[PDB]
Design a binder for this molecule. Sequence first.
Ligand SMILES: CC1=C(/C=C/C(C)=C/C=C/C(C)=C/C=C/C=C(C)/C=C/C=C(C)/C=C/C2=C(C)C(=O)CCC2(C)C)C(C)(C)CCC1
Ligand SMILES: CC1=C(/C=C/C(C)=C/C=C/C(C)=C/C=C/C=C(C)/C=C/C=C(C)/C=C/C2=C(C)C(=O)CCC2(C)C)C(C)(C)CCC1
Lengths: 301, 302
Amino acid sequence: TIDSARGIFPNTLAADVVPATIARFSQLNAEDQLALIWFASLEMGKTLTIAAPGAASMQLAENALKEIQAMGPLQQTQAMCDLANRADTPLCRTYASWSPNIKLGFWYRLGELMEQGFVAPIPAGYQLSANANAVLATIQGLESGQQITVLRNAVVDMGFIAEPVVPPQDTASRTKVSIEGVTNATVLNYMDNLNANDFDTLIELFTSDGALQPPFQRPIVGKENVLRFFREECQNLKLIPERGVTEPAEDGFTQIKVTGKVQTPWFGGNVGMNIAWRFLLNPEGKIFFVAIDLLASPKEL
Amino acid sequence: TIDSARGIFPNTLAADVVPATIARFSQLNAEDQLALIWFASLEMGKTLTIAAPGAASMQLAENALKEIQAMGPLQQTQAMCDLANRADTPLCRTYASWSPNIKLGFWYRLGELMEQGFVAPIPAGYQLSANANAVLATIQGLESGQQITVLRNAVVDMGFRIAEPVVPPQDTASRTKVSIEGVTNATVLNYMDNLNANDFDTLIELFTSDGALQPPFQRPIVGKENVLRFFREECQNLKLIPERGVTEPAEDGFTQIKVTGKVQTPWFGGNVGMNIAWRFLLNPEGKIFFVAIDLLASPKEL
Ligand SMILES: CC1=C(/C=C/C(C)=C/C=C/C(C)=C/C=C/C=C(C)/C=C/C=C(C)/C=C/C2=C(C)C(=O)CCC2(C)C)C(C)(C)CCC1
Ligand SMILES: CC1=C(/C=C/C(C)=C/C=C/C(C)=C/C=C/C=C(C)/C=C/C=C(C)/C=C/C2=C(C)C(=O)CCC2(C)C)C(C)(C)CCC1
């Protein structure tokens, strides 16, 4: 079973504080949510700078952005609350149709306009609720890797269409990773092809019924689904695995675990996220299941 | 706005450790989830015993319970994993159609059969994962009030509208009235009294047509039709025991009232007193536009 494979290398300690904090955040009042994120990014931006959104991304979020700017300050803040409350709204429906990167670039743009004053800002001297206060304190106590994940997910969870697929990296321009302990070809091809945005080659590593499980999400099942996931969300990452361990599995399978770091194009090398990959390969070396964990600490490798 | 009303009495500290812990639980392996609940249940049972499920409830879950028993051990544990993983399954679909009380009684009965051996039990000596172990430690460090809420919610979230029969409102002469230090408000007192009497028809009349009720850690349930369905499906045989409250003016001639006290669920009777806050937003005529029910972080929140 795919669902059973979810339990390989059960010693792996994932940072479940992330979804735990996201759950707390979700309980909050809409204006409190917006205020909290404002407060958090304002303080993170002091040391971490967000990569400017892509051109195609901006073009796609341009209509919604203009519409909000045309609104009066009241309607502006009301439309932001709608996004936050996951209200049924034309704006929220369009927002929901966006890929994570477009949603992110959408809010990236609102944040500038708010600081400039052209869009209704978080009220001045605004005070967070008792609960909201605690949630922000928890966030600020987190590793940057976990901080940005918490923010990314809170944004993706709002609302009620993706970027263009960049061409695979030129073959001669590609680099190969090395993993202490792991020479397995599937694992190595996985890493290399993903770093080269070669999703077409990547997907061929999977079994037809194979699954990929992103951090704190359910397994994405089937080649069609996994490939869409690659094309919509997994562009321009930098996988930097370090060590791995190789073990036999039931029915002639092989389970491999690799730990290392990953970089998002949104923050580049300024935020190195601690990641574990858990592979379950069939006898022919096909990926039946691969899980990506955000690790609790560097103490997880 | 209903969603804006969600922010009344903002300094009220709710036990968001509950949904946080539920979020951690959900990340877990299906088998680790079942084992964890088994472990927590087995330890809680030491000092807190669960009330037996209702007869009507049992009859309603009887078919599903039978089917699972007829299965071989392997298929039994697999069906249990389906529920946990929220797999798309005829069983899960039937489970999903049930009211929380029926789901709960369903599992109540499975647990007896497992302890008796008639249904495949949690593998002996089984070891929880790193993450699963932590989640159990957090649960065991919680107040019983928050422990049972965590378990209730984990169960309700399983599967992929069948409900118990509505009990008759308590005889009018037999009804008690609550008292609340500082609060003589008629709506508030009627709310408490009618609920304790299972008189939902009278109770629902206190709401504005577009009024909402927000259960702990849930979104506002909006509209008299929806709220009343909620009353009939989930809110029978509660015991509300408010203690004090504070009354304040609100925008547009409204009035916001906050009441703190305890609540008892028929599942545990007086063995678990939950710390609860009520936050009312009443319109000029005294209709409930919004009422939120919070599980409080600590007795220090009363
Ligand atoms: C909201 C809001 C505002 C704006 C907030 C902004 C602007 C926040 C921007 C946050 C961003 C920029 C977050 C970026 C997160 C990036 C992440 C978390 C990347 C993680 C990638 C991973 C870990 C991928 C791992 C993978 C691996 C390695 C595989 O092996 C397979 C594929 C895959 C699974 C993908 C303001 C302030 C105005 C206030 C009002 C409301
Ligand atoms: C799973 C599982 C198993 C069985 C587990 C079982 C059997 C667990 C049973 C637990 C139960 C029985 C918990 C019950 C909790 C009930 C609660 C938490 C009630 C709280 C009610 C409140 C707070 C309502 C407040 C209200 C107020 C006062 C209002 O003003 C308006 C209405 C409302 C909002 C309703 C075993 C072990 C075999 C292992 C395998 C898997």
